[PDB]
Amino acid sequence: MVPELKQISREEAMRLGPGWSHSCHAMLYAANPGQLFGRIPMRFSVLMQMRFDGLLGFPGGFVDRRFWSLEDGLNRVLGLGGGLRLTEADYLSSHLTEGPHRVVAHLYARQLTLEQLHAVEISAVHSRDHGLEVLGLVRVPLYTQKDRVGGFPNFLSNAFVSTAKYQLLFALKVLNMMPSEKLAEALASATEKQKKALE
Amino acid sequence: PELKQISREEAMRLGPGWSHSCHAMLYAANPGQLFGRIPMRFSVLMQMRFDGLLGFPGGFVDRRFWSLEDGLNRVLGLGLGGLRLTEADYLSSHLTEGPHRVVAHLYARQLTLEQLHAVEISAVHSRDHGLEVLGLVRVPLYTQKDRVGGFPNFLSNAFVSTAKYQLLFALKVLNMMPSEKLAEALASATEKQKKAL
């Protein structure tokens, strides 16, 4: 169980006054036919990143609406380097963050080929933001090993930007990349792992 | 969780029933400053593994046929891309928490920040990228004004237990961070984790 964030419509988000900050982040993913150890289907690979503050999050950042539309802003704030362009067709959701500052978090999601996803990873290591704001990209493992913790459940027990962890689970669910009951199982495994470490 | 440190010689005398792992801690002094005011001090490479945990580059070495160095370098050739370590880079051997019989050997090498970046570029092109290795990360060793941003948040991630111990061990014995500062970062990380729940 994660703390539920309030979802609002894009139209509502556009009506927000100047006292609201807007963040735009991108969930880039690819179908992945690979099989770990020749037997565990990887299904999809999703990109996240280690941030300067020691937490996992998505590529992106704050967008100043005095100057930019959400899409123009996002494409400018993507510390991936490259030629990838996101459009309003890739817009997925807007959620109000936990605060206390007034922030709406916009999520864009785009499916790429696995070769294109790798090109993004290569671009990122050469990016101006690498080693400053961004400390490295990681692929999310969506599979679970036989021990029932290796892979996705262990991954979910990492330290996230709270908004990004919610957005990841939200997107996996609404984009039909993972059944909800499987997400619940991985999250339960991660949360119990965390609780028993703290004992 | 204190691991028992033993000598290379002791490790070899445990016998054929023991497995050996070798991992490398690659790091660089880093003159950068976060926000132009927070000294970065050093950058250390770790990686996201296939099992969803942070660890160091490296893996199991079959000591029946391989020296620790040759074994390590072959695993690094597939997973980092051709950097080669020597016996001069050997740092420590620890018995891992049981019940499995594993001795964990740690190698450490200081690189320039330029050489460290070359390793990161090599890694994204390596054979193991997207299979056993899911991406490299730099450790943030600084702590932000809120006293959690940076190193304490980082320590609240999920690690191979042995690797987390090895990181803290190496930061101490290599004089990269004072013991009391490490203790302080760990305490903050724990307090973060408990309030997260």
Numbering used by the authors:
A (entry chain A): 5 to 85, 87 to 204
B (entry chain B): 7 to 203
Study text:
The tumor suppressor p53-binding protein 1 (53BP1) plays a pivotal role in orchestrating the choice of DSB repair pathway. Central to the 53BP1 function is the recruitment of 53BP1 to the damaged chromatin via the recognition of di-methylated lysine 20 of histone H4 (H4K20me2) and ubiquitinated lysine 15 of histone H2A (H2AK15ub). More recently, a Tudor-interacting repair regulator (TIRR) has been characterized as a novel 53BP1 regulator, which directly binds to 53BP1 Tudor domain and blocks its H4K20me2 binding surface. In this study, we report the high-resolution structure of TIRR in complex with the tandem Tudor domain of 53BP1.
The crystal structure of the complex reconstituted with mouse TIRR and 53BP1 Tudor at 2:1 molar ratio is determined at 1.76-Å resolution by molecular replacement. In the complex structure, a TIRR monomer comprises seven α-helices (α1–α7) and seven β-strands (β1–β7), whereas 53BP1 Tudor comprises two α-helices (α1–α2) and ten β-strands (β1–β5, β1′–β5′). The complex structure shows that the N-terminal region (residues 10–24) and the L8-loop of TIRR are engaged with a concave surface of 53BP1 Tudor, which is delineated by three loops (L1, L3, and L1′) of 53BP1 Tudor. While the N-terminal region of TIRR engaged with the L1-loop and L3-loop of 53BP1 Tudor, TIRR L8-loop mainly interacted with the 53BP1 Tudor L1′-loop. TIRR residues I12, L20, and W24 in the N-terminal region, together with residue L101 in β5-strand, engage with 53BP1 residues W1495, Y1523. In brief, TIRR residues P105, H106 form hydrophobic cluster with 53BP1 residues Y1500, Y1502 in L1 loop and L1547, and F1553 in L1′ loop. TIRR uses its N-terminal region coupled with L8-loop to block the methylation reader binding surface in Tudor, thus abolishing the access of 53BP1 to nucleosome bearing H4K20me2.
